[PDB]
Symmetry: C3
Subunit: 454 residues, 3 copies
């Protein structure tokens, strides 16, 4: 058999697991060991997007689940616990395990119970693990996946940083960015029609103030999973290249590629060398996932510009949209205040400010000035002030034809923005009305609901 | 040109073709030959799932079609016959053929006719063949695909077993597991929204008593096709690894991977070494295909356990669901009896027993005992007996909130199971009512139809 | 850094860009240069299919955009202009650029404006470029993508021909082949449900009289892009093999494969050696794209047959359908005449002739003779003449059961053809009625609309 390094030696090792996007330290060991892994399933509500809650089923309290790191040749004694608060039974299938179900039939664990099984890690590589409890797709869709690294005996080459990034497709009853506690939607799941496609379990999980970091000159290794359940990632780094891409424990290593296909249930190790500063975007380049469903993550590089290599600027909201900013916490706060019945004008303003970035600013500018004769102003806009209901219709349904704004004719096309939810339209317009010497007041979600229905 | 081994020598060889999942013997030949291939198209109803018929269009009476095995450098005289019973014309495009359409324009064959053409096999590799008759997608969707192996001159390395597995996506007017003769659905096909995703033309074609077999220590080569028409397979082996994966006749060979992407119309040769006993599941790891649409196949390994490698158990219905059992023939029988107007209580009981496995047993247990205070019992259930109509609503629409069953409170969540068809709900509940000291009687498909409509 | 060939030398070079499917000449240079690239965005209506207009957003007036060819180590001074007629702002992200957004944040260009930025081409390879302006998916869906080649310092090996082919998925409000100016459909785009899947921006862009050409014995290199936005191509050549496939600037080169997966946003260089004459079809082998949505392109090889390699015939309409013929200009003309209110019987006849090929001829024959007792005749058909409205119903809804046509019984199945648009049914039936001694007259689109509604 592969991994024939003899019986376990030394002392038993209690594995230290990490939460995304961090990775345990290299094992730094020259002998096979008995490694005890303890992982606890927790079912819990978390925010999948601002003001959007979802009941996740997790390994270790996170999506993806805790990262496990062992050495090829190790004997792993795997303990799965199911927290007493759980409603469902759970189990585990670790890719890389040699044995039926990857552990599944010996890890069935009812709420409040524990199971264990032992396996030898014969297979070096990066591997997905996931729940294997019928209906398996529901469990995976609810977040039950993570990565296990089985190191080669000599260890991986040293790098400056190691990170943990895992894609998933998610299925809510409601549409993208519809607020509230969103149930799992089996119909969308069977159809492979996700409402969100995310890295690390949430919109913005790895953007803004949650970005990954490194410095010019440093090397970064990313362990990249695709939990699925259903999608295949056209995994890509914007503005950079991967030095190496290696799938699972494969012998083949691809070098110097920017775009690489990760199967559902697959995993890869990628390596990046930081060359010039700025934000490097990890995406699924099936582009509507990246830019319409949440599938964007950032590696932000600090250091000196090199004008011989790249003369240009850091990213902003034209490309990154509303994820250029550190966070969109104002949206969470406004949503909470709506639930509580305490939504103020300022709550709406600050939420709308966050959402305006990209969504409106690309054309109207971050200061609402537009560009005279090309994009009309929202700042001190006579046309806006004249008819706030018309403005709700414009956002929902677009606008074309000749108009006059602040004394100048425009004859262009504003696309419809019907995918915005009622609260989003309301908040954005309340922001605009309360900025730039506009007349104030507010637009409510109910106001927008009525226009959308007419 | 490649394959430049000179003119055909020896005697003409009449190729012996095999039906899935078997493969012809290695050619075991050191000279190029003239090989005569005879393949007959047959249109016929077969069961795509238990009690679900479909009009397949086949090469050689099977889906996938008969396997063809030749040597690089051979001259192949290909004869296509179209059975007199056919309604459609058919033809063939063999990947690996050097010439327009892979043979298509010289193989147009009306019902009751024969065509022939000759090609040299310049290209070693495993290759899909398929029908090439407008509308091509309809013909492929109806089952018209198979594999041709063109061996390298020296032959492939010897292995203990060779098998033939081919994925396809299928488009029925009815939903998954809706009984009856199901028409092809062009709308679903254009949308790439299959109702079934299968290996070898049927649910359960390679599970249970139809599993592939080998023994601990043996090597298994699988010729894996993806007929499509539309899907790309995240092809994966649960609980094992592929020693090698080689696509078509490519020079590159990947080694030691578990998950590998097979294009629509693609084919690969994979190699597996049996290490420990049990069931190894071939899936499309776009998971709802594998676990909700039929895309699972089994390689069952017999031999001694090795507790140093894997301490755990063989798979059961928690992972494999209703495909853990040898077969689900009771469902076929009950469906037939419904058609005939002779459906008995026992017919329903036995069908429901088959369907209960996984679908209900994961939580309620195979003996209906549940787990006290966590999953309520179906065995001798006062709550079930009290209101059989309520039980139909529970299966369709789920249940949550505090309930009392057999003297104990439960406060959990049973997900809706609305994807079950009326007959399935009826049969499952009739099974439950006639087991475990429950009160007997029956639930009909019409009963369930009425609840579903209310 | 890679590409460390020193400062730019010689004279600044103004890059000569080419329109698809042509490629600039090899750079044929041994020193790094400063290369000035000028690319202008143009928004314009073009025909996506005959009689189907679409507002494309283009780099250089074409879909895909102009091809850019530079050498690894070059300093590229990139100038993006946005034509004054544009309504939207645009920018660019070039894969292969080392820097945030691949250029995006330094190329924001309002209508009537110009931007520039400079980058060093560190990375050899073939790379997609595309617009990076929110909503990015809308911009890409409207055609804003192309290829840039960064040659290795020594140049690529010489070949006889180089071509430029780029796949895209498109989202119209109307169905496939519905005539008129078709808006972009955001809902279909988010759902990844394209109405068209095309090479080079239009149905038939690379078929018939627009095919790519080479001769027996010649080598052809194709730079193959996948602009997406969303689909992954099962990219395949019918009746041939790729000598080599190399993705982006990857070190790995696959040899001797026929089917290869191109990620959304990916690109590859493929090499083909012409062996025998005829038409070789480039497809996305997710087959309904190729045969139902437009994803077919042709490389036509001229030269001597070699019966030792392939005895058979060139492709015709059985496989290629209505794209076997040089063009379908009659459809464009009939559509225009409908708009103008001048549609004649002959306009309809000639359009219907074009559409009949494949769609009807596969069974009824190009001369309408059918095959006695198997496919009934359309030529001098008593059954057709007897009831033209019945014939509209047959096309839309199919026909089965015993019928008598010209004295002979048929008992077969004609599938429904409901995906045909009203004008298409009308034109096809008007063609049939005005051919083969049929009674003449005409069927209108309004006639068909009424039957479809009943
Ligand atoms: C560029 C693609 C745009 C984006 C994104 C948004 N708007 Fe827009 N808007 C745009 C144009 C070209 C026009 C004029 C259309 C015409 O017929 O010529 C408009 C117009 C408006 C208006 C009315 C005029 C005014 O007061 O300036 C409003 C109120 C407006 N737009 C609001 C708005 C908001 C809130 C947006 C984000 C949700 C938004 N626009 C996006 C172009 C573009
Ligand atoms: C775990 C995910 C479950 C599966 C799968 C099925 N059932 Fe279930 N069921 C489950 C729970 C947690 C509960 C109680 C819900 C609550 O409010 O606390 C139930 C309840 C029932 C009942 C009613 C109570 C009883 O008689 O025990 C019935 C009749 C029932 N379940 C039937 C049933 C059948 C037939 C299933 C397969 C089709 C099935 N259940 C699946 C949990 C789970
Ligand atoms: C093979 C798959 C077919 C294609 C493609 C088309 N038709 Fe057809 N057609 C076919 C059959 C087998 C039959 C007879 C059905 C039966 O019940 O036995 C028919 C019949 C017709 C008819 C009526 C009979 C006649 O006049 O010959 C018409 C008018 C007809 N078909 C027209 C038609 C046209 C216009 C098509 C392209 C749009 C077309 N058919 C395609 C088989 C097939
Ligand atoms: Cu689980
Ligand atoms: Cu798995
Ligand atoms: Cu056929
Ligand atoms: Cu094919
Ligand atoms: Cu643009
Ligand atoms: Cu890109």
């Amino acid at each position: 058999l592969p991994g024939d390094f003899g019986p376990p030696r030394g002392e038993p090792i209690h594995a230290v697991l990490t939460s995304p996007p961090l990775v345990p330290p290299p094992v730094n060991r020259t002998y096979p060991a008995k490694v005890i892994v303890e992982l606890e399933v927790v079912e819990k509500e978390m925010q999948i997007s601002e003001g959007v809650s979802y009941t996740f089923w997790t390994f270790g309290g996170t999506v993806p689940g805790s990262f496990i790191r062992v050495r090829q040749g190790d004997t792993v004694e795997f303990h799965l616990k199911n927290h007493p608060s759980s409603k469902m039974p759970h189990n585990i299938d670790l890719h890389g395990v040699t044995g039926p179900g990857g552990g599944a039939a010996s890890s069935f664990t009812a709420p409040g119970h524990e199971s264990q099984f032992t396996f030898k890690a014969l297979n070096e590589g990066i591997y997905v693990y996931h729940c294997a409890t019928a209906p398996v797709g529901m469990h995976i869709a609810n977040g039950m996946y993570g990565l296990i690294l089985v190191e080669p005996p000599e260890g991986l080459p040293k790098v400056d940083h190691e990170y943990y990034v895992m894609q998933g497709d998610f299925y809510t009853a409601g549409k993208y960015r519809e607020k509230g506690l969103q149930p799992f939607d089996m119909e969308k799941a069977i159809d492979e029609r996700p409402s969100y496609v995310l890295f690390n379990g949430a919109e913005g999980a790895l953007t803004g103030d949650k970005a990954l970091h490194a410095k010019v000159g440093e090397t970064v290794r990313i362990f990249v999973g695709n939990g699925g359940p259903n999608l295949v990632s056209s995994f890509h780094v914007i503005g950079a290249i991967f030095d190496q891409v290696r799938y699972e424990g494969g012998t083949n290593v691809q070098k110097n590629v920017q775009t690489t296909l990760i199967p559902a249930g697959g995993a890869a190790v990628v390596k990046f060398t930081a060359r010039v500063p700025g934000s490097y975007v990890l995406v699924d380049h099936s582009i509507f996932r990246a830019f319409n469903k949440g599938a964007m993550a950032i590696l932000k590089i600090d250091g000196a510009e090199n004008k011989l290599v790249y003369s240009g600027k850091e990213l902003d909201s034209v490309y990154l949209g509303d994820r250029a900013a550190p966070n969109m916490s104002a949206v969470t706060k406004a949503t909470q205040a709506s639930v509580s019945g305490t939504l103020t004008v300022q709550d709406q303003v600050q939420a709308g400010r966050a959402l305006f970035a990209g969504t409106c600013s690309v054309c109207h500018q971050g200061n609402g000035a537009g560009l005279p004769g090309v994009f009309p102003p929202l700042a001190k806009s006579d046309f806006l002030a004249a008819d706030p209901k018309r403005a709700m219709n414009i956002v929902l349904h677009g606008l074309n034809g000749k108009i006059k704004v602040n004394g100048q004719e425009y004859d262009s096309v504003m696309p419809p923005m019907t995918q915005l939810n009622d609260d989003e339209v309301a908040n954005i317009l309340t922001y605009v009305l309360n900025s730039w010497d506009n007349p104030g007041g507010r637009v409510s979600a109910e106001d927008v609901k009525k226009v959308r229905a007419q």
